[PDB]
């Protein structure tokens, strides 16, 4: 059986097993599962078959959640639809273990070095595992990462489809996206290292590094802090964006000592060395030209991170690679695939 309750602006129809629904993060609520006796998170996906773009995103994220297996990526406990057949099928519900906070809420707590380094180590182990499956994320952000009260971190999502294109000139948080993504260049796996450096820098300051109303505002924030990039970089750009990037003000960049001064880190010797190690890592991750930015593996071996290094976490490959396979189908056909996939669960 199932029943219906309203949580804020949204209605949830779920299985009777799930009780005490309350709002969190709204299409996600917290609940108690009576059968397994644990707190859970329930996310409602309203008509995921509604168009080719929503349908492709829902179906891919459903496949990836079951393909991947790592302690730093959220796992599915259950998935169901309370509708009784295909004709009536409308909504899918995903059920997850309930973590204690999102990474925004954790950053707002003003983290020390032990916690910042451990959370970064786990984010990089997660990314490494995703890359081992052929998934390059491109859209990592703190609101889509959650943390347990013991500091275990889990990435909630899988990012942009390989086809998904981005353009400089044309509702979503974009502040953690790499230069190559926002300028519409090609990308490699280290696109995700830029995002991790943006989060690391925000863990230290508490505020967004490169905020901005649009890609143009965000590019200006990037060059004001880090400096104007090289002519070789600019020459890879498409003509419209190239002309814009070439005719901006010429900035030198601030030294990382000025971008992340000692006075914005946790304390004030032991403190000063930990800040110095963090700056060195930022100087390698927040690098505009991806040809000179470090890799995931080099970041995991870095002095700021490697205090947690454990070969069994780090060398933990995906059981299979994802075949970016997810297909031109009608609305009606997308409905059937998603429905049978949910049933199969
Ligand atoms: N498993 C979970 N444990 C604890 N909190 C969670 C969990 N899943 C989601 N949340 C919380 O709910 C918020 C919204 O979740 P999320 O899956 O990001 O939905 P969304 O932002 O509505 N859709 P998307 O565009 O897919 O990110 C998160 O930022 C968390 O605060
Ligand atoms: Mg979200
Ligand atoms: Mg999502």
Residue numbers in the entry: 7 to 31, 36 to 180, 184 to 281, 284 to 341, 344 to 362
Excerpt from the paper describing this PDB structure:
The Drosophila JNK pathway consists of Drosophila JNK or basket (DJNK) and JNK kinase Hep, which are homologs of JNK and MKK7 in mammals, respectively. Although there are ten JNK isoforms in mammals, only one JNK isoform (DJNK) exists in Drosophila.
The overall DJNK structure is composed of two distinct domains. The N-terminal domain (residues 7–109 and residues 338–362) consists of seven β strands (β1L0, β2L0, β1, β2, β3, β4, and β5) and two α helices (αC and αL16), while the C-terminal domain (residues 110–172 and residues 187–337) contains mostly α helices (αD, αE, αF, αG, αH, αI, αL12, α1L14, α2L14, α3L14 and αIL16,) with five short 310-helices and three β strands (βL5, β7, and β8). The glycine-rich sequence (Gly31-Ser–Gly-Ala-Gln-Gly-Ile-Val38) of DJNK, however, is not well defined, implicating that this loop is highly flexible and does not directly interact with AMP-PNP. The orientation of AMP-PNP in DJNK is determined by the hydrogen bonds between the phosphate groups of AMP-PNP and the backbone amide of Met109 and backbone carbonyl groups of Glu107 and Ser153. No electron density, however, is visible for residues Thr181-Tyr183, including the two phosphorylation sites in the activation loop of DJNK, implying its high flexibility in the unphosphorylated form.
